[PDB]
Structure formats: structure tokens, C-alpha cells
């Protein structure tokens, strides 16, 4: 099970989630179960936390192949969070048993995808480039921002979300 697109809308008003189940033959029995949204405040390592930001159960929408693909567009202001200074964690679940021929390690019910707003980062890069235009010297804040973004990338791809939030809160919010 995987993500098709997991993006925040360019208008900074919707959080786009478009999930799908993998096309391989032995997820025929497997479906999509729920969508749980967490922020940098309510995250826990062991799956979604209690009192989450927004829970979604997918039988509610439909009345079986329609249930294998889902698309959500959440008005972020309705979630009562800041679209610019929020890092969303999007969990998904399966509620379904694959066949007995699955190769090992592929049978995992849950996934996760981190989300942030790239507009503030784009504005910071534009500001630093404007500074570079004057006298052709590289500000050190620009290199610091680049390397800290790469640090958060490494933390996310290695799954070390606690230190990822620590860096986010320490550098890209305050």
C-alpha cells in the first residue's frame, strides 16, 4: 500500500491525500481502512496517538474496488491548525489479510507520510538569493538552512521523527 500524491495545496488551503493499494495480485483481499492525521504536537512512535487531529473511516464515504482507492481534501482551517507552521503525519491502515504467497516483509498494514508547507522555504530561498545578488557573497544562514533541511530529510527517511521535530521546532518555526 502506497501514496499517489501527498501534498499541501498551492493555495495553502487544502491538504491533499490520495492513497492507493498496490496493484500486485495478492492484495486483492486487502482494502483501505482509515486515515489518521497527527501533527508535531500529538505524534507518538507506536502508531497514531490518542486524541488525534482528524480520524477518517472509509466505509462512511462509499455505499469493493472503489474502497481500494481514496482521495481526501481537508480544509486546513477547519482542522484549526496553521498551514505554514504545521508538520502533518498521515497514517493509513488496511483491514485485510494478504494471500499466503506474499514475499516476506511486504505484508505491512500501516504506512506513514510526512507533510510540510514548501512556500515558506521557497520565500526564504528567494530572500537569500536576493541577498546573494548584492555583492555576490553567500550568506551563512542560507547554507545553514540548506543543511538543516537536509538533516530533516535524513531524519524522515530514516524514521527518526523525534529529532526531526526537534530540528523543525528549533529552526523552521522559532
Amino acid at each position: 500500500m502506497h501514496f499517489n500524491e501527498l501534498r499541501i495545496s498551492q493555495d495553502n488551503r487544502f491538504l491533499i491525500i490520495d492513497v492507493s493499494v498496490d496493484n500486485q495480485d495478492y492484495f486483492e483481499d486487502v482494502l483501505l481502512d482509515s486515515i489518521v492525521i497527527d501533527t508535531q504536537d500529538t505524534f507518538v512512535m507506536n502508531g497514531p496517538s490518542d486524541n488525534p487531529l482528524y480520524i477518517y473511516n472509509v466505509e462512511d464515504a462509499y455505499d469493493t474496488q472503489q474502497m481500494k482507492n481514496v482521495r481526501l481534501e481537508l480544509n486546513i482551517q477547519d482542522l484549526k491548525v496553521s498551514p505554514c507552521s504545521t508538520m502533518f503525519f498521515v497514517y493509513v491502515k488496511s483491514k485485510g489479510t494478504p494471500s499466503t504467497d506474499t514475499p516476506c516483509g511486504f505484508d505491512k498494514d500501516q504506512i506513514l507520510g510526512t507533510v510540510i508547507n514548501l512556500q515558506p522555504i521557497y520565500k526564504q530561498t528567494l530572500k537569500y538569493l536576493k541577498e546573494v545578488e548584492c555583492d555576490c557573497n553567500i550568506p551563512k544562514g542560507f547554507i545553514d538552512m540548506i543543511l538543516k533541511l537536509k538533516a530533516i530529510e535524513l531524519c524522515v527517511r530514516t524514521g527518526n521523527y523525534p529529532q526531526a521535530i526537534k530540528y523543525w521546532n528549533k529552526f523552521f518555526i522559532k
Binding site: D33, S34, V36, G47, S49, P52, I55, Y91, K93, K95
Partner: peptide, 19 residues
């Protein structure tokens, strides 16, 4: 945690296992 139903069924299955 966010337990799914099937996990609960597993829990009661293994609890009534020592029935």
C-alpha cells in the same frame, strides 16, 4: 496506538485461548 478491530479479535481469541 490506534487499535484496529481485528487486533481486538486477536486479543479475545488469545484470552479465550485459556478458556
Amino acid at each position: 496506538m490506534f487499535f484496529t478491530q481485528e487486533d481486538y479479535r486477536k486479543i479475545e481469541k488469545w484470552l479465550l485461548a485459556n478458556s
